[PDB]
Design a protein around this motif. Structure first.
Motif, PDB file in Angstrom:
ATOM      1  N   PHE A 207       0.832  -1.194   0.000  1.00 37.72           N
ATOM      2  CA  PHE A 207       0.000   0.000   0.000  1.00 37.72           C
ATOM      3  C   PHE A 207       0.871   1.250   0.000  1.00 37.72           C
ATOM      4  O   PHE A 207       1.566   1.514   0.973  1.00 37.72           O
ATOM      5  CB  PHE A 207      -0.921  -0.015   1.221  1.00 37.72           C
ATOM      6  CG  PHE A 207      -1.841   1.161   1.312  1.00 37.72           C
ATOM      7  CD1 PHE A 207      -2.696   1.473   0.263  1.00 37.72           C
ATOM      8  CD2 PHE A 207      -1.896   1.923   2.464  1.00 37.72           C
ATOM      9  CE1 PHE A 207      -3.562   2.544   0.351  1.00 37.72           C
ATOM     10  CE2 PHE A 207      -2.772   2.997   2.559  1.00 37.72           C
ATOM     11  CZ  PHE A 207      -3.604   3.303   1.501  1.00 37.72           C
ATOM     12  N   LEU A 208       0.834   2.005  -1.095  1.00 35.56           N
ATOM     13  CA  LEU A 208       1.615   3.233  -1.222  1.00 35.56           C
ATOM     14  C   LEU A 208       0.734   4.379  -1.730  1.00 35.56           C
ATOM     15  O   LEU A 208       0.685   4.647  -2.933  1.00 35.56           O
ATOM     16  CB  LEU A 208       2.799   3.012  -2.162  1.00 35.56           C
ATOM     17  CG  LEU A 208       3.739   1.870  -1.773  1.00 35.56           C
ATOM     18  CD1 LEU A 208       4.743   1.588  -2.880  1.00 35.56           C
ATOM     19  CD2 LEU A 208       4.458   2.196  -0.467  1.00 35.56           C
ATOM     20  N   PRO A 209       0.040   5.067  -0.807  1.00 39.01           N
ATOM     21  CA  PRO A 209      -0.972   6.066  -1.185  1.00 39.01           C
ATOM     22  C   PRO A 209      -0.379   7.293  -1.886  1.00 39.01           C
ATOM     23  O   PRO A 209       0.715   7.733  -1.528  1.00 39.01           O
ATOM     24  CB  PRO A 209      -1.607   6.445   0.160  1.00 39.01           C
ATOM     25  CG  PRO A 209      -0.585   6.101   1.189  1.00 39.01           C
ATOM     26  CD  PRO A 209       0.189   4.936   0.653  1.00 39.01           C
ATOM     27  N   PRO A 210      -1.093   7.835  -2.888  1.00 42.64           N
ATOM     28  CA  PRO A 210      -0.586   8.962  -3.681  1.00 42.64           C
ATOM     29  C   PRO A 210      -0.944  10.335  -3.122  1.00 42.64           C
ATOM     30  O   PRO A 210      -0.404  11.335  -3.608  1.00 42.64           O
ATOM     31  CB  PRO A 210      -1.272   8.759  -5.029  1.00 42.64           C
ATOM     32  CG  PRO A 210      -2.602   8.186  -4.650  1.00 42.64           C
ATOM     33  CD  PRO A 210      -2.354   7.311  -3.440  1.00 42.64           C
ATOM     34  N   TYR A 211      -1.846  10.377  -2.143  1.00 41.19           N
ATOM     35  CA  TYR A 211      -2.355  11.633  -1.593  1.00 41.19           C
ATOM     36  C   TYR A 211      -1.209  12.552  -1.166  1.00 41.19           C
ATOM     37  O   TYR A 211      -0.430  12.215  -0.270  1.00 41.19           O
ATOM     38  CB  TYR A 211      -3.289  11.349  -0.412  1.00 41.19           C
ATOM     39  CG  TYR A 211      -4.304  10.261  -0.696  1.00 41.19           C
ATOM     40  CD1 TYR A 211      -5.079  10.285  -1.852  1.00 41.19           C
ATOM     41  CD2 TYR A 211      -4.460   9.188   0.176  1.00 41.19           C
ATOM     42  CE1 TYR A 211      -5.997   9.284  -2.121  1.00 41.19           C
ATOM     43  CE2 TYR A 211      -5.373   8.180  -0.083  1.00 41.19           C
ATOM     44  CZ  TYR A 211      -6.139   8.233  -1.231  1.00 41.19           C
ATOM     45  OH  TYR A 211      -7.049   7.237  -1.491  1.00 41.19           O
ATOM     46  N   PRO A 212      -1.089  13.711  -1.830  1.00 45.45           N
ATOM     47  CA  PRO A 212       0.025  14.633  -1.586  1.00 45.45           C
ATOM     48  C   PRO A 212      -0.212  15.508  -0.361  1.00 45.45           C
ATOM     49  O   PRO A 212      -0.289  16.730  -0.502  1.00 45.45           O
ATOM     50  CB  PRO A 212       0.061  15.476  -2.864  1.00 45.45           C
ATOM     51  CG  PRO A 212      -1.365  15.521  -3.306  1.00 45.45           C
ATOM     52  CD  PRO A 212      -1.970  14.186  -2.915  1.00 45.45           C
ATOM     53  N   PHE A 213      -0.326  14.889   0.815  1.00 44.20           N
ATOM     54  CA  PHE A 213      -0.619  15.618   2.046  1.00 44.20           C
ATOM     55  C   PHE A 213       0.413  16.716   2.302  1.00 44.20           C
ATOM     56  O   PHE A 213       0.090  17.772   2.849  1.00 44.20           O
ATOM     57  CB  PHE A 213      -0.668  14.666   3.246  1.00 44.20           C
ATOM     58  CG  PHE A 213      -1.826  13.696   3.223  1.00 44.20           C
ATOM     59  CD1 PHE A 213      -3.134  14.144   3.343  1.00 44.20           C
ATOM     60  CD2 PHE A 213      -1.602  12.333   3.110  1.00 44.20           C
ATOM     61  CE1 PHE A 213      -4.196  13.251   3.338  1.00 44.20           C
ATOM     62  CE2 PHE A 213      -2.659  11.436   3.110  1.00 44.20           C
ATOM     63  CZ  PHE A 213      -3.960  11.900   3.223  1.00 44.20           C
ATOM     64  N   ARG A 214       1.652  16.467   1.891  1.00 48.70           N
ATOM     65  CA  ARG A 214       2.738  17.403   2.144  1.00 48.70           C
ATOM     66  C   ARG A 214       3.261  18.049   0.864  1.00 48.70           C
ATOM     67  O   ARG A 214       4.406  18.495   0.807  1.00 48.70           O
ATOM     68  CB  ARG A 214       3.864  16.691   2.885  1.00 48.70           C
ATOM     69  CG  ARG A 214       3.430  16.174   4.244  1.00 48.70           C
ATOM     70  CD  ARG A 214       4.387  15.141   4.776  1.00 48.70           C
ATOM     71  NE  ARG A 214       4.370  13.917   3.990  1.00 48.70           N
ATOM     72  CZ  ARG A 214       4.837  12.755   4.429  1.00 48.70           C
ATOM     73  NH1 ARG A 214       5.359  12.673   5.646  1.00 48.70           N
ATOM     74  NH2 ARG A 214       4.784  11.678   3.656  1.00 48.70           N
TER      75      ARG A 214
END
Ligand code: C5P
Ligand code: C5P
Lengths: 390, 390
Positions: A5-12
């Motif tokens: 699992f490697l989420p793409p969501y660019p939180f930073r």
């Protein structure tokens, strides 16, 4: 097989934030892996605007032990991609604060995410029963909830607190959580009677040291990356500025040495504190009588070199620091270093991962790790001999 | 082997609160069971100051299908017992509120509890490796955290929303959570295409009814209010802050008192005074629902009953059947209710059957699960249900 699992969501603010792990698992792959990730992870190599990324730096590749994947390497594996419409929607539900949205991702269930995960895993029948375990680089209650429903385990895996070039590369592998909500203290309390290590903390430190040590403030302050998951979810509300204030209660400025994290976007002005400019964190802590941190890797470094260390945040090594005796501390640190931490390359090795999925005894785990470190019998005898042989 | 968790903590003021499940597992045992419980559970049956408890009532025994265990029945199993010193500490840590203490037990990790669970499980060698799954009558993140570390699943098992004598006995079996945090809707979303049911809502209800439904009522009330037991876990943790009195207030915002019919839970310590609300005195909740045009509930079992009779239903709390209520179409509602009744719900005796439990532990397809259940009830997936409904 593995489901990574490697989420793409660019939180930073960074696309494909976990790209290095993607490349490492690809490089060390021996079987087909299911990647649950984003399209950004696949297109990043042809994006000309991203070629200055550290993941493409040959020095970083060599340090982490991977090379860039070609079309052939990619084709050996299966991919499920998460959609961005959820990330916008996620932001919408947290006052458009990406950091608080990251915090929710790390510490709360998100029904919409769980739904999409279930749908992706179901998109091709057979996929779910091919899965031996999930792997995640961070805590994610959405994924973990999905995993229970499906009867799968979740290994939480991350680069460890000791890293090249100063140290042998290490990694975390934790079935409960990484950094926060770890199972290190629980594992130790079960096997603590097996640890009778005839060495000091500095001897343990020396075993992992790969360089000649660098060879005088009362207080050393370790600062961290401001939007690290450690300072978002596992910090007990402490920040770099409130850590500084904490130390400032206890010391005058003349007794304070502050080291900013090299990977931070911010750095100190040089008007108010004495600023550290050491070439590494070890040379920095060596100048300090006691060390203050929230939950930095450097906290462990301070502990292994015998410094009195204050840890304000949650972290995997904190239980070592909570023990009173010197002998008790050494035995706990030895378990941590030799059984909790994993030789870095091994957490990308499918044979080793299947070994851990069987939940073997602590003795077997230590045996495997020392076998690797000595690439070149009781548990305590194994470690003592390893230390003596150097 | 099974590991059955039956905590002794008297949150609601009663010793051995889950005594009935203890007796049921003992009766249906076909193999040695590991009970993680309290010694209160072992001393009650011969503590004759406890005779007046409902668990010993021959009607209850017949209804739940168990008999009292003898000394030989007990000796077939292994026991680990939890200390009360933790309970006192737990209370003092929550302002001596036993209900808020219950809430923390249900929804939060409790480090001290995890330590004791780990120590008990690790107390005698051989125990953990012989555990196929944990079973808990309630949500317990402490246990669930421990189970992750050890690599074991947690089945959450409880008596279902349809119970004898009115209905066939049913049970919950949910790997993520029971009542709160359930996986019912997730399971349905995954398999909803397989449910194309050609039967009426009344047909489904009739299949589970052991008796004939009540004739058309003379006089109908506009709104029916279902009250629950005030310190039920459903009104403590899964209620979205709603209470019996705030539910009444909710309905009074929408209806005059003359249009409201309120039915207290027969198990409650409290009941309404005779002069402000019209009070129901029906022989059962089905006869009560029959007199109402629409029904209001927090998360009572009776909510499901209202849905199965086609009444407009308002559900203010979290519960397993809520996703059914959120659908717009009558036929879509039938399909979902069919999944819920035949695949989510389990025939009551089977959740105490080790062979069935090992079957579910293999995480089989929905079609297989429905088949197993219908086989029991009878003493494509849709065609199998369509035929059963007959
Ligand atoms: N104040 C700091 C914080 C981290 N670091 C470096 O970053 C590594 C990772 O530390 P963190 O866990 O704090 O991110 C350390 O092992 C150390 O090499 C540093 O050199 N000075
Ligand atoms: N207001 C209520 C609530 C529950 N009940 C009975 O208690 C059973 C369990 O309901 P709960 O889920 O509310 O505890 C119902 O199936 C019904 O037989 C009732 O008769 N009147």
């Amino acid at each position: 097989g593995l489901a990574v699992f490697l989420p793409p969501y660019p939180f930073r603010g960074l696309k494909a934030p976990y790209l290095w792990m993607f490349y490492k698992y690809l490089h060390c792959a021996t079987d087909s892996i299911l990647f649950i990730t984003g399209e950004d992870y696949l297109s990043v190599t042809d994006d000309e605007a991203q070629r200055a990324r550290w993941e493409f730096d040959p020095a970083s590749m060599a340090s982490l032990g991977y090379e860039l994947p070609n079309a052939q390497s990619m084709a050996c594996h299966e991919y499920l991609t998460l959609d961005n419409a959820f990330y916008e929607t996620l932001l919408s539900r947290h006052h458009h604060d990406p950091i608080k949205s990251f915090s929710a991702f790390l510490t709360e269930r998100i029904p919409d995410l769980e739904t999409e995960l279930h749908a992706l895993l179901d998109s091709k029948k057979g996929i779910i029963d091919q899965i031996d375990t999930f792997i995640s680089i961070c805590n994610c209650p959405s994924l973990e909830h999905v995993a229970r429903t499906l009867g799968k385990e979740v290994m939480h895996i991350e680069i460890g607190p000791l890293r090249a070039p100063m140290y042998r590369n290490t990694a975390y592998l934790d079935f409960a959580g990484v950094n926060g909500g770890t199972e290190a203290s629980a594992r130790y309390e079960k096997c603590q009677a097996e640890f009778d290590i005839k060495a000091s903390l500095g001897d343990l430190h020396n075993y992992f040291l790969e360089v000649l040590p660098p060879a005088h403030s009362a207080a050393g302050v370790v600062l961290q990356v401001e939007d690290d998951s450690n300072l978002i979810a596992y910090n007990h509300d402490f920040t770099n500025i409130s850590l500084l204030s904490y130390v400032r209660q206890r010391y005058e400025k003349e007794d304070i040495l502050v080291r900013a994290h090299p990977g931070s976007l911010f750095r100190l002005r040089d008007d108010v504190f004495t600023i550290d400019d050491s070439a590494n964190s070890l040379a920095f802590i060596n100048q300090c009588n006691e060390v203050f941190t929230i939950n930095s890797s450097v906290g462990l470094e301070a502990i292994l070199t015998g410094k009195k260390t204050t840890v304000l945040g949650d972290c995997s090594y904190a239980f070592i620091n909570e023990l009173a005796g010197a002998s008790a501390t050494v035995n706990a640190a030895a378990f941590y270093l030799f059984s909790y931490l994993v030789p870095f390359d091994l957490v990308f090795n499918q044979e080793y991962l299947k070994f851990r999925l069987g939940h073997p005894e602590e003795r077997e785990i230590v045996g495997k790790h020392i076998e690797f470190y000595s690439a070149d019998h009781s548990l305590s005898s194994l470690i003592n001999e390893a230390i003596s042989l150097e």
